[PDB]
Design a protein around this ligand. Structure first.
Ligand SMILES: [Zn+2]
Ligand SMILES: [Zn+2]
Length: 43
């Protein structure tokens, strides 16, 4: 059920920002333009 995980989970799907980073604790992929490696919803 983990689809569209090529695009930053913090970025809206209409924006389509490629996720170069991924938050390890939740495995949600993120753009460094939003969060550096770790998503704000963890720790
Ligand atoms: Zn983003
Ligand atoms: Zn996270």
């Amino acid at each position: 059920v983990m689809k569209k995980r090529t695009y930053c989970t913090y970025c809206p799907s209409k924006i389509r920002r490629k996720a170069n980073a991924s938050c390890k604790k939740c495995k949600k992929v993120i753009c460094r333009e939003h969060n550096i490696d770790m998503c704000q919803s963890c720790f």
